[PDB]
Amino acid sequence: SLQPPPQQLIVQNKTIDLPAVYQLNGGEEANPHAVKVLKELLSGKQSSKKGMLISIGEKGDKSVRKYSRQIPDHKEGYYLSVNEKEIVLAGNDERGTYYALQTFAQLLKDGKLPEVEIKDYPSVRYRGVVEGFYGTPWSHQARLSQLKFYGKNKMNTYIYGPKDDPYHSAPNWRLPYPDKEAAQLQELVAVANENEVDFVWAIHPGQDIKWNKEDRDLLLAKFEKMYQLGVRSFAVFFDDISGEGTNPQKQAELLNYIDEKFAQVKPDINQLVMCPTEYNKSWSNPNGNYLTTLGDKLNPSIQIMWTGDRVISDITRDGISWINERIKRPAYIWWNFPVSDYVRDHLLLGPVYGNDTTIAKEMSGFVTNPMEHAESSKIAIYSVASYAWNPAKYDTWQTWKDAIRTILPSAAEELECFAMHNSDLGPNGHGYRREESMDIQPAAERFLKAFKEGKNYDKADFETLQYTFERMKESADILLMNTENKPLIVEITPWVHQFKLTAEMGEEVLKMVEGRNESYFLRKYNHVKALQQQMFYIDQTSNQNPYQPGVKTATRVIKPLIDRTFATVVKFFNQKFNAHLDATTDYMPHKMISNNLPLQVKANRVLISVEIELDAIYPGENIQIGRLEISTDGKEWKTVDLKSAGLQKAPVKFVRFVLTIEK
Ligand SMILES: CCCCCN1[C@H](CO)[C@@H](O)[C@H](O)[C@@H]1CC(=O)NC
């Protein structure tokens, strides 16, 4: 399974051994990066003018002048051939030769190559990743790993633009990077070049830029500094800003100035890209004409980025046609998946889908904006690389599975199981959702409805859920201890813990359904309650970011199933034995009674999704949003004036909608 799949491929049953004795032709002429790969593959073998001939080089080189008619005439294209006599590795250009070797490495199996003939090239000119999310920027080591990953999957673009990098955005975009960061960026560019990736440094000056000579010159000075560090591609982002920086005329004038006074003056600058303020259709204002102004004034060689019909959306034919009409050029797609900086309590490990597969000529580029979890994002990145190179042959599920098997060969099935139930985003402001747990969804839906109505559920459906919960535990435990991709495991470990707890809770609830005698049911009930508390603990101690703290997993299908199944069987138990067991599905140490919604704890905040009772006395900070008071014993009370009032560290245990307290 070659990924990306080549444009043209012909194979037949013939096994060629990786020759013990080879003759390299064009090792001096070909792309040095491609040669280094070939020599690592050919290491151990003998090099001489005897044995099998191996021709490598670019179109025009002496080594492959013979096969020049087979070499596709596209950028980054190449021709690859293997048979009993000769191996050919000829690129249309140097990057093409490199890509020929990346395919060749996939063909090599047990030192045996298939008799194949390949003519290949990308359908989309620029393909890769934009690190453009809010949150903790990728570590240096993560980025180094990413760049090698891009090379292997023929992604030629990495756009550096972490929103929370102070030297990328306001106010310190005017300042050069410190020596430490500068040295690191320098290395990244070098490693990017070694993997045939264009390192595109982006700048985000819009929020506080003044349209004068001072800021213009400082921007160019900053660009000049990056150039000295080795950067040869550049970008200017005007996304998520207000004020004068949103002026389309001024944006275009600035980019054209950069183009003519810097990009065209330098001898070796490649990509020049801008992200508009109106970067999707829904945010595009029809009463004005921001986009058509950019389209007309911005020099045509300059790329304009676009996220689709919405901030989070999949690219359609009518969608790309709509934007292209206005910007007078093929849009440079910025796809906001698997970025999760607005649902930071979720991992988005599902397959890549939704994007039209016939519109390759309608886009100048396609890059993905990923999670701040770098390794975890490789599932989607690997898939986008496949899609972008050969959209006509893009296989959603096969590529997903191939990605997982590549990222974690030693535990691919376990990672599949985990990712299968960690793909949906849950409710969010963008209304963007993904499928999850569709394998077991039908059995869960039938089981629960039959259980609710008091009908007999299918034995098969019950056993499916049992198998699933069991498999989830195996996967969670094996993943925790996996040492093949340690950085990956560090990223997902909190979710894996929550994942196992979900599975354990699921098992115990099904036993409550199966349960015959009373004391056994009660044992299971108490165990579930304890597991709920454990999930609460993880939710409060892991991933404690300011926006969506905590750890959520298997939210679309499985947790609702377990919660509703637990509530129902407890309800039936109370009816039967005249008991009054609590059917609460999520642990909450605090309480709230009123003239009624579930409470939630987020960081040092207690909130309603009336009287609240905390599990202890804390110093109060404020109460942001019958009377309004506070108390420590629930007998004596103390009123506060809402001016959303302050508490001034006053001891509080009762409150009569968010309460903030001190640690
Ligand atoms: C509604 C404003 C937030 C939109 C921000 N989106 C992403 C969603 O988190 C974020 O990662 C990034 O800054 C992006 C901006 C954007 O869409 N650029 C083309």
Short mmCIF file of N, CA, C and O in Angstrom, two decimals, residues 361-475:
data_model
loop_
_atom_site.label_atom_id
_atom_site.label_comp_id
_atom_site.label_asym_id
_atom_site.label_seq_id
_atom_site.Cartn_x
_atom_site.Cartn_y
_atom_site.Cartn_z
N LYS A 361 -7.43 21.14 -9.32
CA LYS A 361 -6.99 22.24 -10.16
C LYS A 361 -7.54 23.58 -9.68
O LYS A 361 -7.12 24.64 -10.15
N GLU A 362 -8.48 23.53 -8.74
CA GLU A 362 -9.15 24.73 -8.26
C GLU A 362 -8.50 25.30 -7.01
O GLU A 362 -8.98 26.29 -6.44
N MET A 363 -7.41 24.68 -6.57
CA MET A 363 -6.70 25.14 -5.38
C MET A 363 -5.20 25.24 -5.63
O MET A 363 -4.60 24.36 -6.25
N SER A 364 -4.60 26.33 -5.16
CA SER A 364 -3.17 26.56 -5.28
C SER A 364 -2.41 25.72 -4.27
O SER A 364 -1.24 25.38 -4.48
N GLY A 365 -3.07 25.40 -3.16
CA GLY A 365 -2.44 24.63 -2.11
C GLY A 365 -3.47 24.06 -1.15
O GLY A 365 -4.65 24.41 -1.19
N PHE A 366 -3.01 23.17 -0.29
CA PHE A 366 -3.85 22.58 0.74
C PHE A 366 -2.99 22.23 1.93
O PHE A 366 -2.12 21.36 1.85
N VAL A 367 -3.22 22.93 3.04
CA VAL A 367 -2.52 22.64 4.28
C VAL A 367 -3.51 22.42 5.39
O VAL A 367 -4.60 22.99 5.40
N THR A 368 -3.12 21.58 6.34
CA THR A 368 -3.93 21.30 7.51
C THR A 368 -3.42 22.04 8.74
O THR A 368 -2.22 22.10 8.99
N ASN A 369 -4.36 22.59 9.50
CA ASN A 369 -4.07 23.16 10.82
C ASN A 369 -4.33 22.11 11.89
O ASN A 369 -5.48 21.69 12.08
N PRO A 370 -3.28 21.65 12.60
CA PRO A 370 -3.41 20.48 13.47
C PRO A 370 -3.65 20.80 14.95
O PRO A 370 -3.78 21.97 15.31
N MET A 371 -3.73 19.75 15.78
CA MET A 371 -3.78 19.89 17.24
C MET A 371 -2.42 20.33 17.78
O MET A 371 -1.40 20.13 17.11
N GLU A 372 -2.38 20.88 18.98
CA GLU A 372 -1.10 21.18 19.61
C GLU A 372 -0.41 19.88 20.02
O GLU A 372 0.77 19.88 20.39
N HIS A 373 -1.15 18.78 19.95
CA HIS A 373 -0.56 17.45 20.06
C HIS A 373 0.01 17.04 18.70
O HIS A 373 -0.72 16.61 17.81
N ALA A 374 1.33 17.17 18.57
CA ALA A 374 2.01 16.98 17.29
C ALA A 374 1.92 15.55 16.76
O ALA A 374 1.53 15.33 15.62
N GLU A 375 2.33 14.59 17.58
CA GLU A 375 2.34 13.19 17.15
C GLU A 375 0.93 12.73 16.81
O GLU A 375 0.70 12.13 15.76
N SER A 376 -0.01 13.01 17.71
CA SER A 376 -1.41 12.63 17.54
C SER A 376 -2.00 13.16 16.24
O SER A 376 -2.91 12.56 15.67
N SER A 377 -1.47 14.29 15.78
CA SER A 377 -1.96 14.92 14.56
C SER A 377 -1.45 14.22 13.31
O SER A 377 -1.94 14.47 12.21
N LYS A 378 -0.47 13.33 13.47
CA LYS A 378 0.10 12.64 12.31
C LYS A 378 -0.92 11.75 11.59
O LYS A 378 -0.74 11.44 10.42
N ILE A 379 -1.97 11.33 12.29
CA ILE A 379 -3.01 10.53 11.65
C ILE A 379 -3.68 11.34 10.55
O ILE A 379 -3.81 10.88 9.41
N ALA A 380 -4.10 12.56 10.89
CA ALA A 380 -4.73 13.45 9.92
C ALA A 380 -3.73 13.99 8.89
O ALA A 380 -4.05 14.09 7.71
N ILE A 381 -2.53 14.33 9.35
CA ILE A 381 -1.50 14.87 8.46
C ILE A 381 -1.13 13.88 7.36
O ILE A 381 -1.10 14.23 6.19
N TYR A 382 -0.84 12.65 7.76
CA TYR A 382 -0.58 11.55 6.84
C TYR A 382 -1.69 11.41 5.81
O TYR A 382 -1.44 11.15 4.63
N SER A 383 -2.93 11.60 6.26
CA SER A 383 -4.09 11.45 5.38
C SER A 383 -4.24 12.62 4.42
O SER A 383 -4.60 12.43 3.26
N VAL A 384 -3.98 13.83 4.91
CA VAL A 384 -4.04 15.03 4.08
C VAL A 384 -2.98 14.96 2.98
O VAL A 384 -3.21 15.40 1.86
N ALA A 385 -1.81 14.41 3.32
CA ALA A 385 -0.73 14.24 2.37
C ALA A 385 -1.16 13.31 1.25
O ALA A 385 -0.88 13.54 0.08
N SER A 386 -1.85 12.24 1.63
CA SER A 386 -2.38 11.29 0.66
C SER A 386 -3.42 11.98 -0.22
O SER A 386 -3.34 11.92 -1.45
N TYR A 387 -4.37 12.65 0.42
CA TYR A 387 -5.44 13.34 -0.29
C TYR A 387 -4.90 14.39 -1.26
O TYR A 387 -5.34 14.48 -2.41
N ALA A 388 -3.94 15.17 -0.80
CA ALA A 388 -3.43 16.31 -1.56
C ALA A 388 -2.60 15.87 -2.76
O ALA A 388 -2.62 16.52 -3.81
N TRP A 389 -1.87 14.77 -2.60
CA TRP A 389 -1.04 14.26 -3.68
C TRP A 389 -1.89 13.61 -4.78
O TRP A 389 -1.68 13.86 -5.97
N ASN A 390 -2.84 12.77 -4.37
CA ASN A 390 -3.70 12.06 -5.32
C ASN A 390 -5.14 12.04 -4.84
O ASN A 390 -5.63 11.00 -4.38
N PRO A 391 -5.84 13.18 -4.94
CA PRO A 391 -7.23 13.25 -4.47
C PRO A 391 -8.16 12.29 -5.20
O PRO A 391 -9.13 11.82 -4.61
N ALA A 392 -7.87 12.00 -6.47
CA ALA A 392 -8.74 11.13 -7.27
C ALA A 392 -8.79 9.69 -6.73
O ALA A 392 -9.77 8.98 -6.97
N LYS A 393 -7.74 9.28 -6.03
CA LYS A 393 -7.65 7.92 -5.49
C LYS A 393 -7.71 7.91 -3.96
O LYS A 393 -7.39 6.90 -3.34
N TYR A 394 -8.12 9.02 -3.37
CA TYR A 394 -8.10 9.14 -1.91
C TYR A 394 -9.06 8.16 -1.24
O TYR A 394 -10.27 8.23 -1.43
N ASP A 395 -8.49 7.26 -0.45
CA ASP A 395 -9.26 6.26 0.28
C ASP A 395 -9.27 6.62 1.76
O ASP A 395 -8.28 6.40 2.46
N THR A 396 -10.38 7.17 2.21
CA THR A 396 -10.50 7.71 3.57
C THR A 396 -10.07 6.73 4.65
O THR A 396 -9.19 7.04 5.46
N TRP A 397 -10.70 5.56 4.67
CA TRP A 397 -10.50 4.60 5.75
C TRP A 397 -9.18 3.85 5.63
O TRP A 397 -8.49 3.64 6.62
N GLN A 398 -8.83 3.44 4.41
CA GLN A 398 -7.56 2.74 4.19
C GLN A 398 -6.38 3.61 4.59
O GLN A 398 -5.41 3.13 5.18
N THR A 399 -6.46 4.90 4.28
CA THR A 399 -5.39 5.84 4.60
C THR A 399 -5.31 6.06 6.11
O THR A 399 -4.22 6.15 6.68
N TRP A 400 -6.47 6.14 6.76
CA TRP A 400 -6.55 6.26 8.21
C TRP A 400 -5.82 5.08 8.87
O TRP A 400 -4.95 5.27 9.71
N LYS A 401 -6.17 3.87 8.44
CA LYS A 401 -5.53 2.67 8.95
C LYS A 401 -4.04 2.63 8.62
O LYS A 401 -3.23 2.24 9.47
N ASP A 402 -3.67 3.04 7.41
CA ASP A 402 -2.26 3.10 7.01
C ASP A 402 -1.48 4.09 7.88
O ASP A 402 -0.35 3.82 8.28
N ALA A 403 -2.08 5.25 8.13
CA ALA A 403 -1.49 6.25 9.02
C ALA A 403 -1.18 5.65 10.39
O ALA A 403 -0.06 5.74 10.88
N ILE A 404 -2.18 5.03 11.00
CA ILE A 404 -2.04 4.44 12.33
C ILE A 404 -0.97 3.36 12.35
O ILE A 404 -0.17 3.28 13.28
N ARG A 405 -0.94 2.53 11.31
CA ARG A 405 0.02 1.44 11.21
C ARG A 405 1.45 1.98 11.02
O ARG A 405 2.42 1.33 11.40
N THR A 406 1.55 3.17 10.45
CA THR A 406 2.85 3.82 10.23
C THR A 406 3.35 4.46 11.51
O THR A 406 4.52 4.34 11.87
N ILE A 407 2.45 5.15 12.19
CA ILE A 407 2.77 5.89 13.41
C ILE A 407 3.11 4.95 14.56
O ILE A 407 4.01 5.24 15.36
N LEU A 408 2.41 3.82 14.66
CA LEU A 408 2.60 2.90 15.78
C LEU A 408 2.45 1.44 15.35
O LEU A 408 1.47 0.78 15.70
N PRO A 409 3.43 0.93 14.59
CA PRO A 409 3.37 -0.43 14.05
C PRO A 409 3.17 -1.50 15.12
O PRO A 409 2.48 -2.49 14.88
N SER A 410 3.76 -1.30 16.29
CA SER A 410 3.75 -2.32 17.33
C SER A 410 2.39 -2.47 18.03
O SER A 410 2.15 -3.47 18.70
N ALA A 411 1.52 -1.47 17.88
CA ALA A 411 0.21 -1.50 18.53
C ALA A 411 -0.84 -0.79 17.69
O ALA A 411 -1.61 0.03 18.19
N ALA A 412 -0.87 -1.12 16.40
CA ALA A 412 -1.76 -0.46 15.45
C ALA A 412 -3.23 -0.72 15.77
O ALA A 412 -4.04 0.21 15.75
N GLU A 413 -3.58 -1.97 16.05
CA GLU A 413 -4.96 -2.31 16.35
C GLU A 413 -5.44 -1.59 17.61
O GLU A 413 -6.58 -1.13 17.68
N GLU A 414 -4.56 -1.48 18.60
CA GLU A 414 -4.91 -0.80 19.84
C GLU A 414 -5.12 0.69 19.58
O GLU A 414 -6.02 1.31 20.15
N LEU A 415 -4.29 1.27 18.72
CA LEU A 415 -4.41 2.69 18.40
C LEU A 415 -5.66 2.94 17.55
O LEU A 415 -6.28 3.99 17.66
N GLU A 416 -6.02 1.96 16.72
CA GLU A 416 -7.25 2.05 15.93
C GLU A 416 -8.45 2.09 16.85
O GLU A 416 -9.33 2.93 16.70
N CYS A 417 -8.48 1.16 17.80
CA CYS A 417 -9.56 1.09 18.77
C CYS A 417 -9.71 2.41 19.52
O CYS A 417 -10.81 2.94 19.66
N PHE A 418 -8.59 2.94 20.00
CA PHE A 418 -8.60 4.20 20.73
C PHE A 418 -9.10 5.36 19.85
O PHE A 418 -10.00 6.10 20.24
N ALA A 419 -8.52 5.49 18.66
CA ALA A 419 -8.86 6.59 17.76
C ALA A 419 -10.30 6.49 17.26
O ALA A 419 -10.95 7.50 16.99
N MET A 420 -10.79 5.26 17.13
CA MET A 420 -12.16 5.01 16.68
C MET A 420 -13.18 5.72 17.57
O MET A 420 -14.19 6.24 17.08
N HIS A 421 -12.91 5.72 18.87
CA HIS A 421 -13.82 6.30 19.86
C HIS A 421 -13.30 7.62 20.41
O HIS A 421 -13.70 8.05 21.50
N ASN A 422 -12.41 8.26 19.66
CA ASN A 422 -11.87 9.57 20.01
C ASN A 422 -11.75 10.42 18.75
O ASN A 422 -10.64 10.78 18.35
N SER A 423 -12.87 10.74 18.12
CA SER A 423 -12.85 11.44 16.84
C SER A 423 -13.85 12.58 16.79
O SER A 423 -13.66 13.54 16.04
N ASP A 424 -14.92 12.49 17.56
CA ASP A 424 -15.92 13.54 17.56
C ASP A 424 -15.45 14.72 18.42
O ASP A 424 -14.65 14.54 19.34
N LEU A 425 -15.94 15.91 18.10
CA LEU A 425 -15.53 17.13 18.81
C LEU A 425 -16.45 17.44 19.97
O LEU A 425 -16.10 18.23 20.86
N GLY A 426 -17.64 16.84 19.96
CA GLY A 426 -18.68 17.21 20.90
C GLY A 426 -19.24 18.56 20.52
O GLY A 426 -18.75 19.20 19.58
N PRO A 427 -20.27 19.02 21.24
CA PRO A 427 -20.89 20.31 20.94
C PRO A 427 -19.88 21.46 20.98
O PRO A 427 -19.01 21.49 21.86
N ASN A 428 -19.99 22.38 20.04
CA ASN A 428 -19.11 23.54 19.99
C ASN A 428 -19.74 24.67 19.19
O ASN A 428 -20.72 24.46 18.48
N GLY A 429 -19.16 25.86 19.30
CA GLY A 429 -19.71 27.04 18.65
C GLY A 429 -19.68 27.00 17.13
O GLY A 429 -20.49 27.66 16.48
N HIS A 430 -18.76 26.22 16.57
CA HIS A 430 -18.62 26.13 15.11
C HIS A 430 -19.57 25.10 14.52
O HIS A 430 -19.72 25.02 13.30
N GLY A 431 -20.19 24.30 15.38
CA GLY A 431 -21.13 23.28 14.94
C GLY A 431 -20.49 22.18 14.10
O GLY A 431 -21.18 21.46 13.39
N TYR A 432 -19.18 22.05 14.20
CA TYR A 432 -18.44 21.06 13.43
C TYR A 432 -18.34 19.75 14.19
O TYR A 432 -17.83 19.71 15.31
N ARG A 433 -18.82 18.68 13.57
CA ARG A 433 -18.82 17.36 14.20
C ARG A 433 -18.18 16.33 13.29
O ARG A 433 -18.09 16.52 12.08
N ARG A 434 -17.72 15.24 13.90
CA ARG A 434 -17.17 14.11 13.16
C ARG A 434 -17.83 12.83 13.65
O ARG A 434 -18.31 12.77 14.79
N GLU A 435 -17.87 11.81 12.80
CA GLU A 435 -18.45 10.53 13.16
C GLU A 435 -17.58 9.85 14.22
O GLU A 435 -16.38 10.10 14.30
N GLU A 436 -18.20 9.01 15.04
CA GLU A 436 -17.47 8.31 16.08
C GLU A 436 -18.21 7.04 16.46
O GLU A 436 -19.44 7.02 16.51
N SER A 437 -17.45 5.98 16.70
CA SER A 437 -18.00 4.73 17.20
C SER A 437 -19.17 4.22 16.35
O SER A 437 -20.13 3.67 16.87
N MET A 438 -19.08 4.40 15.03
CA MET A 438 -20.16 4.00 14.13
C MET A 438 -20.26 2.48 14.00
O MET A 438 -21.32 1.96 13.64
N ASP A 439 -19.17 1.78 14.30
CA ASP A 439 -19.16 0.32 14.30
C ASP A 439 -20.22 -0.28 15.23
O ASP A 439 -20.92 -1.23 14.88
N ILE A 440 -20.34 0.30 16.42
CA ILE A 440 -21.18 -0.27 17.47
C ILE A 440 -22.44 0.55 17.72
O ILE A 440 -23.31 0.15 18.49
N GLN A 441 -22.54 1.70 17.04
CA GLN A 441 -23.66 2.62 17.21
C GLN A 441 -25.04 1.94 17.07
O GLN A 441 -25.90 2.12 17.92
N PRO A 442 -25.24 1.16 15.99
CA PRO A 442 -26.55 0.51 15.82
C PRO A 442 -26.92 -0.46 16.95
O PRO A 442 -28.09 -0.51 17.34
N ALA A 443 -25.95 -1.22 17.45
CA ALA A 443 -26.21 -2.19 18.51
C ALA A 443 -26.49 -1.47 19.83
O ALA A 443 -27.29 -1.93 20.65
N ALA A 444 -25.82 -0.34 20.03
CA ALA A 444 -26.03 0.48 21.22
C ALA A 444 -27.41 1.13 21.21
O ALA A 444 -28.09 1.16 22.23
N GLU A 445 -27.82 1.63 20.05
CA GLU A 445 -29.11 2.30 19.91
C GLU A 445 -30.28 1.33 20.09
O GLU A 445 -31.29 1.68 20.71
N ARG A 446 -30.14 0.12 19.56
CA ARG A 446 -31.18 -0.89 19.71
C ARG A 446 -31.25 -1.38 21.14
O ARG A 446 -32.34 -1.57 21.69
N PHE A 447 -30.09 -1.62 21.73
CA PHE A 447 -30.02 -2.16 23.08
C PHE A 447 -30.69 -1.22 24.07
O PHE A 447 -31.50 -1.64 24.90
N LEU A 448 -30.36 0.06 23.96
CA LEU A 448 -30.84 1.06 24.91
C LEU A 448 -32.35 1.29 24.78
O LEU A 448 -33.05 1.40 25.78
N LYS A 449 -32.85 1.36 23.55
CA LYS A 449 -34.28 1.56 23.32
C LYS A 449 -35.07 0.36 23.83
O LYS A 449 -36.13 0.52 24.44
N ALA A 450 -34.56 -0.84 23.58
CA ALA A 450 -35.21 -2.05 24.07
C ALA A 450 -35.17 -2.10 25.59
O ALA A 450 -36.13 -2.54 26.23
N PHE A 451 -34.07 -1.64 26.16
CA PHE A 451 -33.90 -1.65 27.61
C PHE A 451 -34.83 -0.62 28.26
O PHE A 451 -35.51 -0.93 29.24
N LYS A 452 -34.86 0.58 27.69
CA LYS A 452 -35.74 1.65 28.17
C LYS A 452 -37.20 1.19 28.19
O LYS A 452 -37.88 1.28 29.21
N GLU A 453 -37.67 0.70 27.05
CA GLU A 453 -39.07 0.30 26.90
C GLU A 453 -39.41 -0.96 27.69
O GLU A 453 -40.59 -1.31 27.82
N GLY A 454 -38.40 -1.65 28.21
CA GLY A 454 -38.61 -2.86 28.97
C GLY A 454 -38.68 -4.11 28.11
O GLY A 454 -39.00 -5.20 28.59
N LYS A 455 -38.40 -3.95 26.82
CA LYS A 455 -38.36 -5.08 25.89
C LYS A 455 -37.06 -5.86 26.02
O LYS A 455 -36.11 -5.39 26.64
N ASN A 456 -37.02 -7.04 25.42
CA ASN A 456 -35.82 -7.87 25.43
C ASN A 456 -34.81 -7.41 24.39
O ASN A 456 -35.08 -7.45 23.19
N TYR A 457 -33.65 -6.96 24.85
CA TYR A 457 -32.57 -6.58 23.95
C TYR A 457 -31.99 -7.83 23.29
O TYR A 457 -32.13 -8.94 23.82
N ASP A 458 -31.34 -7.66 22.14
CA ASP A 458 -30.72 -8.78 21.45
C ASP A 458 -29.44 -9.22 22.15
O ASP A 458 -28.60 -8.39 22.52
N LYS A 459 -29.31 -10.53 22.33
CA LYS A 459 -28.12 -11.13 22.93
C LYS A 459 -26.86 -10.69 22.19
O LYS A 459 -25.83 -10.43 22.81
N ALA A 460 -26.97 -10.58 20.87
CA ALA A 460 -25.85 -10.16 20.04
C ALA A 460 -25.41 -8.74 20.37
O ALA A 460 -24.22 -8.45 20.47
N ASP A 461 -26.38 -7.84 20.52
CA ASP A 461 -26.09 -6.44 20.82
C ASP A 461 -25.42 -6.31 22.18
O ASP A 461 -24.51 -5.50 22.35
N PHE A 462 -25.86 -7.11 23.15
CA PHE A 462 -25.28 -7.07 24.49
C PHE A 462 -23.83 -7.54 24.45
O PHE A 462 -22.97 -6.96 25.11
N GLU A 463 -23.56 -8.58 23.67
CA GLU A 463 -22.22 -9.16 23.60
C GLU A 463 -21.26 -8.27 22.82
O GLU A 463 -20.05 -8.31 23.05
N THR A 464 -21.80 -7.49 21.89
CA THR A 464 -21.02 -6.52 21.15
C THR A 464 -20.45 -5.46 22.09
O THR A 464 -19.27 -5.11 22.01
N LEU A 465 -21.30 -4.95 22.97
CA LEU A 465 -20.90 -3.93 23.92
C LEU A 465 -19.88 -4.48 24.91
O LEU A 465 -18.92 -3.79 25.28
N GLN A 466 -20.09 -5.72 25.33
CA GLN A 466 -19.14 -6.41 26.20
C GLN A 466 -17.76 -6.53 25.54
O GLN A 466 -16.75 -6.20 26.15
N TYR A 467 -17.74 -6.99 24.29
CA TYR A 467 -16.50 -7.11 23.52
C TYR A 467 -15.80 -5.76 23.42
O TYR A 467 -14.58 -5.67 23.59
N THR A 468 -16.58 -4.73 23.13
CA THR A 468 -16.04 -3.39 22.95
C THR A 468 -15.36 -2.90 24.21
O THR A 468 -14.21 -2.45 24.17
N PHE A 469 -16.06 -2.98 25.34
CA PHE A 469 -15.50 -2.51 26.60
C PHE A 469 -14.23 -3.29 26.94
O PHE A 469 -13.24 -2.71 27.39
N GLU A 470 -14.26 -4.60 26.71
CA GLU A 470 -13.09 -5.43 26.96
C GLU A 470 -11.92 -5.01 26.07
O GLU A 470 -10.80 -4.87 26.54
N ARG A 471 -12.20 -4.80 24.79
CA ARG A 471 -11.16 -4.41 23.84
C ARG A 471 -10.57 -3.04 24.19
O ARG A 471 -9.37 -2.81 24.04
N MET A 472 -11.43 -2.14 24.67
CA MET A 472 -10.99 -0.80 25.05
C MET A 472 -9.97 -0.85 26.19
O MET A 472 -9.01 -0.08 26.20
N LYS A 473 -10.17 -1.75 27.15
CA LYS A 473 -9.26 -1.87 28.28
C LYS A 473 -7.91 -2.41 27.83
O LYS A 473 -6.86 -1.92 28.25
N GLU A 474 -7.94 -3.44 27.00
CA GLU A 474 -6.72 -4.00 26.44
C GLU A 474 -5.92 -2.92 25.72
O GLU A 474 -4.71 -2.79 25.92
N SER A 475 -6.61 -2.14 24.90
CA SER A 475 -5.97 -1.12 24.09
C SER A 475 -5.36 -0.04 24.97
O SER A 475 -4.21 0.35 24.78
#
